[PDB]
DNA sequence: TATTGGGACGAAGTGCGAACGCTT
DNA sequence: AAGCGTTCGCACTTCGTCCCAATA
């Protein structure tokens, strides 16, 4: 059955997909803002207003397809809008492609230059072209006046702000809100400019001054393209091909009438066998490596491009007969020649993957396809949840003046925030990442982005039109016909020498969720696989979890003091599930068991956190920032020396071998290590203290007390002596001082006296992995875990059994 | 011996100096240093008395930091009879404590038309500040005179978990402070940050400060003595069971530093004295009662679960043990008690040293002027909180406080606006210092000393150097480490009494109440929950029910797998307390399941059908009636997967952990086996047979047959709004008679026989009704902060385009 | 059969003259 | 605008772990 809800749910899903990308702009703008005029340009390349006459409005905002001549229309308009040779202008881009292109492509203008590296002068800057992420180092030189302003891919330009790669955001936001107050004329343009951008520009220069252009033409490469969403993956034809041949008789009994739906690997076979040239988008690497291993049976001259392969220019694609690629082509350049006969795409919505806008910008990287084909498969395994674009959202968004909620719905404890610019467009980054949780919604977003570029999207069977029934009956197929095939992509998965294990590991959800919690977000997958290989062994798990608790008790200093708070930290970091790679190269989950009595662990991190602070510990910076002699080690331990001796002894043979950290192997290592320690009083304190220090750091956390070459103490080498830091090394050792004021002479004094600073020194070095945990210095955008640590350090423990 | 040197002198010197600055021990030193224009006076003889209210020298706003026991309210009577002229003059008096709401309206005889808290004409009104959200919007906008009695307590109850309309009560208080011309404020621990806040809003020249230095004999001129030893070796010999008393031992031969609590108690109680005993914990109050019962029969106990007696009931008894209940009751005035003992214990979920201080002053005058205090540091082992790094940062910055221990700045919770933000530091350092014994001890030593009482530590008759304090401190830390063993082999042993007070003191149980439950709960209903929670089925039903409510609070969790791992790992893993059948408390682990999809796919179904109902586990089960007509409409929209999961969960190949455990999967398979196949049976009757197993086995919530005469509300003794007219046209026929709601009910009394059908409601069992749920209201814990994060932050792409 | 002592190479620092930034 | 306070390119080497080949 249809189930009643599906008419309302489909029609809501399609309507919000249309609204978020501005598919309704020709109806909404003349209804809600009568003082704004709107242009529809229904044929031929786009054209802007008159570039010189006084009758044109000063703010014009353009929604116009990918591949419709927009750079040519901007060239035609900018050469006029620069009114005089003294007129000065600024151009902003999100994408790298225009920073290289526009400065090279403008021939109708002079003194134009790309992003600033070495031209710094003091100030001359006009006709500057910039990547928005780099704007912070250029801002002071702009002098805060321009006569003309241009934004292309403006929803990407205001969309870069949400990405973790932008830094010093608030000061760049405060500059963006300085240009945009219509000191210049403004032109703003995108393929998906929307109602909320037209509204926001009214909020900077009023309804009277805003003009809207809507383009509905795109080049033959797109307007003749005939996308088709297939019903079934066809892995049974893959298993007959990529594997060695099956038995001479007894094939699979299912799907004998083709299951009345053409299949991706079935259709791919025909074009490669017919001698066509072809190209293959793949949103995940694990399928890219599989379809490479398939294609070499039909045509040996395959190419494969993904984020761990080396740099290769798009001009090289003329030689190869199959080119396979992932979303790395977004930051590349268009393939302008005519070569490929058609195109295939495996799109897979998943929680840590690409947005459907990022897929659409990658499909468009080959311009003309000779037959006009394109076949897309949407793999619904891993995205089969209840929808996000509900009729409960539609009624709210359509009753309001087109304004969206800032969360999943209306509301309230929240972060500090940027300006009106950052907060106005936060709704779009939210729903671009929520909708990946559903295969409908994701399919209706992708279906919109294609249908806004004239691409005649079709399903299987339904050559022309679909009712709500026809659509809902289609997804009851691809939800099941994908899931029952998914097991094949575990058997076929690469264990050959070509296998990109660092890429195929990181693709999983379980690794994504570990990287979010424990590590720095900028780690290379190659260093995660060096870590996850250690965390398989029970000793390796133990050291990593002790070192994660040491870092947390430095970040949250209240954890060293209240026992109630340390239970909340221990339950969050040192319990649950981790991913690990076993001796075979397969990836397996491991459960970390809880412990009832955390007291023996807490007393030992409580006595190590104060001994780490005093050595300027930061595991992201390699280890201890300060060198110590053996006498300094004695001075670290001496205040609590008998208590270090007690707690190192107790963990050798605890009452119960509970949880992870007091497990049977973990207790044995410390009991073993105590056999090599000199007995108390048999050797000098400066020796016994070193012998105990090396055991408590060495077995629990794994960190070595290495020698170091530093010819003066503290953090600084001889290259970084300063007029301040010299004096501390004149006070100690009582050097004669009374020197000449000039630092050249203070250096020459110590380089004569350097023999005073002979003698042994040590430094703590962290073990190769573990140099990538999120330490106290390693700042990043807030995740849910950084919020929880900010909660523990700010809210006090309020009393329970109360007189009200 | 043990080394001390001078390394630890900064710890004491910082600790004592920060304690001083928090409670205002440096008014009339800091004021000339930082605000020279503000006038200051010292009163050192007899009662305090405020400046004349009638003269031209009646400047603006006055703040008073007079001791307890120095005549605050009588000096206010003198000042207010000079401040009130003609009856048209306008006044308001604010109190935090209940005691003045009863007292002042009864005690004022020099004035008329005065009244206590309200249950347009309003003047001479006296109010509890916890009523200000009801009272405030009914008041006139400005008054000629304003009294803030116990001001630091008045804007102190403002931080209470049960406070209402906080975002407007901050603004109401600010409006009164901004434009009332004459104001007086009177807390015995007023401080420099209240001086600064009023100097900010009214100007440095305007404010005047009164500092009291004398308090009446007996009331606040005792001889407080701290003792170094509890003396439990005497206790466990004294509480010897029947038979022989047993012989002495040579371990008693040491000097015991010359004094012990149980020794100095016994020597006076045997010597004929009548003795109160305060105890911060009930588990010690119930022991020291038994130690007196063998010496005399006239022994009371008054802990928080007993019926509260009026203090005139005391004075019959030889002993009257009590525990912080007297925070909200009247003070005992008669000269009955010879002396008094206290046991104070810093605890992370216990009462703070200012709440302990005003519990010791609830007995007023003593026949020999003595008071002996023991600080049990056994659960305050930790490193100091009042560090020199905090002292330097505060003292360098004009004495401004940082309001968190990190000294660093981003959750903008901001429930108030300005008063809430200015004073937030005080509640934070009042709770944090209970983590440590030295810092709790130096606060309590200050609060006694800044109220005239001479404080001594036993054996140090003249004065303490930092080293002398550090010797006494490490001593009493060792005493409480040893003596705590005796207090565990001794116990109440449950004479059919006080299990909830013995349970509730445990820090493991506080952690359970703040994570899962409503903070409204009494100890009595925690015990019967934790006693159920010991059974393996009980603890499985509880955690399925806790997860169902989180799936209604966070609506992304029912649709993102990455989000449901954050919720599952938090509400369904880790350690919980339980009560064993033996009558003792035991911790039990919830082990981490590797694969959660079998659970997520079930909650994803239950939290959609629970939203077709109005499910609300604190208010009932279902807020809505339903029947076998409706149950078909619950199951049939998504039936293709409901058919599998309840059967398949009973037949899984492997058992990852609790929610899929060997006991649970057999139990659900056995229960489900009574369901027919889809053949030779009614679809509705098959549907409801399945429905009772899904809800009944896994969540523990049964059906009950409807007593409602109509759908929704349907009692007939009295009518309720819209419940008749909202059904009167639902039968698709017109009555045309009348529109007045009440008398129309007779029309539905015809329809009752054709509205009829089999109708039911889900109901939550007696243990389940104290969960924190989506309909509830409370102040933010770390967990409500987390659920705001999971719902408001989207999930970023990780293997990124680097 | 008997088990370890010698060689390679990552990686963090030495020390000369110098470069950048600044204000006589 | 010459003297001058942080910071460094380059050629050199010292520490510790990996590995193997020559003994037994
Ligand atoms: N590097 C280039 N060389 C030549 N023409 C280019 C180049 N980059 C862009 N174009 C122009 O781009 C037009 C395609 O339509 P447009 O809407 O202008 O594409 P666009 O929005 O610039 O897309 P891209 O992704 O930036 S090429 C072509 O007709 C070209 O004239
Ligand atoms: N509860 C009370 N019972 C009797 N007299 C009281 C009481 N409270 C105040 N007084 C009178 O006011 C003075 C004592 O008040 P203080 O101890 O200085 O401060 P207070 O806060 O008013 O006392 P409390 O807290 O109300 S017991 C004496 O003159 C008493 O006669
Ligand atoms: Mg463009």
Residue numbers in the entry:
A (entry chain A): 18 to 139, 145 to 433, 451 to 843
B (entry chain B): 16 to 134, 145 to 434, 451 to 843
Provide the authors' original text about this structure:
At the core of HSV-1 replication initiation is the OBP, a 94 kDa protein encoded by the UL9 gene.
Within this pocket, we observe a seemingly unusual nucleotide interaction pattern: K87 of motif I contacts the α- and β-phosphates of ATPγS, while backbone amides from S85, G86, K87, and T88 form hydrogen bonds with the α-phosphate. Therefore, our structure potentially represents a non-catalytic state before ATP adopts a position in its pocket that is consistent with turnover. Within motif Ia, our structure shows that R112 reorients to interact with the γ-phosphate of ATPγS. The catalytic Mg2+ ion is coordinated by D174 and E175 within motif II, underscoring their critical role in helicase activity, as evidenced by the loss of function in E175A mutants. Each monomer threads its C-terminal end through its partner molecule, bringing it into close proximity with the ATP-binding pocket in the other monomer.
